[PDB]
């Protein structure tokens, strides 16, 4: 039936792979879901301003 041991286990992304063996880690990397979050690194500020507004009030 297969095992659940492929690092990206319980991963939020949905990977559609191909595997011939019992262990899921032997499976290919396959197609994945495309999600992003430029903010966690670009705008990790507590308060948000917006372009139209002046950064420092």
Partner 1 sequence: SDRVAQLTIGNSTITTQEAANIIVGYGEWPSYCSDDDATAVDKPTRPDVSVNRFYTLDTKLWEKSSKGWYWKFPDVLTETGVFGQNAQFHYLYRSGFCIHVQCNASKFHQGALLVAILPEYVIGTSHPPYKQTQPGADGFELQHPYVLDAGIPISQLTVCPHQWINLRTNNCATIIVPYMNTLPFDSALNHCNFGLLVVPISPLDFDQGATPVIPITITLAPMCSEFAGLRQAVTQ
Partner 2 sequence: DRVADVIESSIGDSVSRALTQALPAPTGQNTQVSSHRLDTGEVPALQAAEIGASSNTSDESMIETRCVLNSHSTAETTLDSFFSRAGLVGEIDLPLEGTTNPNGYANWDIDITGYAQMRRKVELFTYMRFDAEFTFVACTPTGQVVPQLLQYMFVPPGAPKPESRESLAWQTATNPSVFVKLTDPPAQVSVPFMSPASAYQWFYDGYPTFGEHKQEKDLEYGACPNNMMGTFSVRNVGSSKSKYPLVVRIYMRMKHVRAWIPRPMRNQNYLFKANPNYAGNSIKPTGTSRTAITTL
49-52 contact pairs (CB < 8 A, 24+):
none
Which of the listed partners (a second copy, partner 2, partner 1, none) does 16 bind, with a CB threshold of 5 to 8 Å by partner kind? a second copy
5 touches a second copy by CB under 8 A:
no
Q: What are the two backbone dihedrals, phi and then psi, of residue 31, each rounded to the nearest 5 degrees? A: -70, 140
Query: Binds 57, which of a second copy, partner 2, partner 1, none (CB < 5 to 8 A, cut-off by type)?
Result: partner 1
Shortest distance (Å) from residue 37 CB to partner 1: 8
Nearest alpha-carbon partner for 28 in 40, 36, 18, 16: 18
């Amino acid at each position: 039936h297969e095992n659940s041991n492929s690092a990206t286990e319980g991963s939020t992304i949905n990977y559609t792979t191909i595997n011939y063996y019992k262990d899921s880690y032997a499976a290919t990397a396959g197609k994945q879901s495309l999600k992003q979050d430029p903010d966690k690194f670009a705008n990790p500020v507590k308060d948000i301003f917006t372009e139209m507004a002046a950064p420092l009030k």
